[PDB]
Amino acid sequence: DAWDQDRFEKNFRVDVVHMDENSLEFDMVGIDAAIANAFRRILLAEVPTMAVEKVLVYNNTSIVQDEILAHRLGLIPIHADPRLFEYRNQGDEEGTEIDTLQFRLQVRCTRNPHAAKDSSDPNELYVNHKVYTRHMTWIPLGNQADLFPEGTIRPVHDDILIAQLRPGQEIDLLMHCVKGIGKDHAKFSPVATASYRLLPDITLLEPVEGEAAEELSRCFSPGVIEVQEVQGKKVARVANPRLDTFSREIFRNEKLKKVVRLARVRDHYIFSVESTGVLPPDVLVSEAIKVLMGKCRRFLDELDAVQ
Amino acid sequence: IVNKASWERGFAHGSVYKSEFIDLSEKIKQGDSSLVFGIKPGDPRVLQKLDDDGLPFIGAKLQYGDPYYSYLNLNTGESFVMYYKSKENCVVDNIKVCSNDTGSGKFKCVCITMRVPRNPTIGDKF
Amino acid sequence: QQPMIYICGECHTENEIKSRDPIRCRECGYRIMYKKRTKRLVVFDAR
Amino acid sequence: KTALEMVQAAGTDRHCVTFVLHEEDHTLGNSLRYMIMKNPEVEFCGYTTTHPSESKINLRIQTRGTLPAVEPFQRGLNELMNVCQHVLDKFEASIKDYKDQKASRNE
Amino acid sequence: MIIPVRCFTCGKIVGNKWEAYLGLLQAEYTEGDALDALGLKRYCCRRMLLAHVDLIEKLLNYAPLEK
RNA sequence: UAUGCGCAUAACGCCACAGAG
Ligand SMILES: [Zn+2]
Ligand SMILES: [Zn+2]
């Protein structure tokens, strides 16, 4: 049987379960594991983001040492739109307005002069004793201050604890953000995790009644088996089998392992995309589909350049 | 097998701190007993690579062949420089300077401590 | 210009040490002195 | 600069050619293998990654009659692109359906 | 030493949840309930914060300047 | 012989501990 595009467009549908900021559960119905895993792998490792690459330290008197603090700072998500920037070329130590961002972190811990009152907590004894992510100040280079409104280029989370100081200690450094894909380094990955699972279909091969219905309700996840008193006696039925986690606990009950059938619905996926905050997750899934279209267009242009 | 993305996040990252105790009396025994760490001012072998006491900066990195320390002879004037002969790039951690037991010792014992990164690579044992 | 500051191990006071003078802290006479870290550019990769 | 190498067999038939796709892994390879195996005029198709140190895949296509194995490769690329375009349209329409139903049911 | 920025296994930002975790545990929550109130659902995320030993407060008792 | 730029510097054993397979 050939590839019928019309049959695919009849049987394919997307059902959105829940979408807030930084999470998205949806369904893909009637697509194969090859393409669904392609989308999952693009979301993991090939949708580009902006992340700190070079850290120019000037003074670092903290105990969080320098090459550790650089890696520390590279793992912070930078809330930029990566589609407005470009790849820095091979060998450019100095990036321009097109392809880099700058952040200055300059925090000095001093002792709180007044209002200490011989206490013990560090929040009263010291000032700037914890270096958070709100201390990172964006340094616009070129015309980036006019291109981006104020408060747009920033880290995603302010209150990620970078380091921790004591009086006298100082962190003075400058960060350069570049664009890359998560195949290169995991700091560029835009998702917390992106994954899928096929939808389970639990069916009852035999009517289950009485205390066996309560055992059946407890051998599954809370919610899939609705045990209900129709006559006063209890019968069990499957109600929303999406909740089941395949603990397969019903296969340990010797009597009731013959009345159910756990399988999966073929080609019915449940994706979950959890953005770190760089882009909204529906935008991440759109860009992840466009990446695979770009791969196909890349090799079609290679074939047309050979011909 | 280790996940690449876990290794690229902070999984099992490390360091090793090598401390090299440098004594100009014990090793550099040429005579005259008047060697002190320092540079001859205007030396093109140590420019912006050792500090004015002939001793590397504390933030500094050390590749192979970089100047490691410089010491000058006080009764002569000639300054020597010693180069970093290890093949691993390290970052200077601290430099402590030592006297003798009386506080009368001269600027000739030092103890450089360097950090070598050593994150988990292919071939490391868990 | 730009003196070489060393920090005592005990009292943590800043000590200038030239080539010829004996090394000991000018306040407490302690024998170990740590070199001061000064502001100077070093470049690291966030990786 | 060249991402695609076409390696014909020792026979000059052009019906059994290995495609070497540089800077590529299981994503495009497995999706293309799925879309090329839908062609009735394809005798054999599989991909493999050569070594983990390298970043490329070998992709074999063997056709039956007189068509060269460049035509199923190009047709599989176009069909996978059309698949992804339709998935993009369905996904964006469903997300827009969610954002309109949600913003009006709380008001 | 210091709370990791991301979880090791998945890349979930866990570095902004250490002070929230301590404030939940001082408010007399169970550690399982305190990990639920932070939204740590996978046990990879949940061991990153459950098993974190924070050596930087012990390592800053030797703070040099003491001034 | 090695490094550095024909030139300058550095040119090892014996015990004892500890470890790897
Ligand atoms: Zn002193
Ligand atoms: Zn996790």
Give a brief rundown of this model.
It is classed as transcription. The entry lists the keywords RNA polymerase I, human, rRNA transcription, DNA-dependent RNA polymerase, elongation state, transcription. By secondary structure, chain B is mainly β.
List keywords for this structure.
part of a larger assembly, 5 chains, A: 307 residues, five-stranded antiparallel sheet, four-stranded antiparallel sheet, 7 helices, 17 strands, 32% strand, E: 67 residues, mainly alpha, 4 helices, binds zinc ion, RNA-binding, disease variant (chain A), cytoplasm (chain A), acetylation (chain A), leukodystrophy (chain A)
Write the layout of secondary structure elements.
This is part of a larger assembly, with chains A (307 residues), B (126 residues), C (47 residues), D (107 residues) and E (67 residues).
Chain C: E1 5-8, E2 14-16, E3 32-35, E4 42-45
Antiparallel strand pairs in C: 1-2, 1-3
Chain D: E1 4-8, E2 16-22, H1 26-36, E3 42-49, E4 56-63, H2 71-105
Helix pairs in contact in D: 1-2
Chain E: H1 18-26, H2 31-36, H3 43-50, H4 55-59
The structure holds zinc ion (2 copies).
Chain B binds one RNA strand of 21 nucleotides through strand 5.
PDB class: transcription
Keywords: RNA polymerase I, DNA-dependent RNA polymerase, elongation state, transcription
Entry title: Cryo-EM structure of human RNA Polymerase I in elongation state
Explain what the structure shows.
This is part of a larger assembly, with chains A (307 residues), B (126 residues), C (47 residues), D (107 residues) and E (67 residues). Chain A is built from seven helices and 17 strands. Chain A is α+β, with helices and mostly antiparallel strands. In chain A, helix 2 packs across helix 7. In chain B, a hairpin with a 5-residue loop joins strand 4 (67-73) and strand 5 (79-83). Chain B is elongated and about 60 Å long. In chain D, helix 1 (26-36) packs across helix 2 (71-105). Chain D is of the alpha+beta class and 107 residues long. In chain D, a hairpin with a 6-residue loop joins strand 3 (42-49) and strand 4. In chain D, strands 1-2-4-3 form a four-stranded antiparallel beta sheet, covered by helices on one side. The A-D interface holds A 1-3, 5, 8-9, 12-16, 19, 26, 28, 31-32, 34-35, 37-38, 41-42, 46, 282, 285-286, 289-290, 292-293, 295-300, 302-303, 306 and D 2-4, 6, 21, 24-28, 30-31, 33-35, 38-40, 70, 73-74, 77-88, 90-95, 97-99, 102. Strand 6 of chain B pairs antiparallel with strand 3 (32-35) of chain C, so a sheet runs across the interface. The structure holds one RNA strand of 21 nucleotides. Chain E: Pfam families: RNA_pol_N. Chain E: Keywords: DNA-directed RNA polymerase, Metal-binding, Nucleus, Transcription, Zinc.
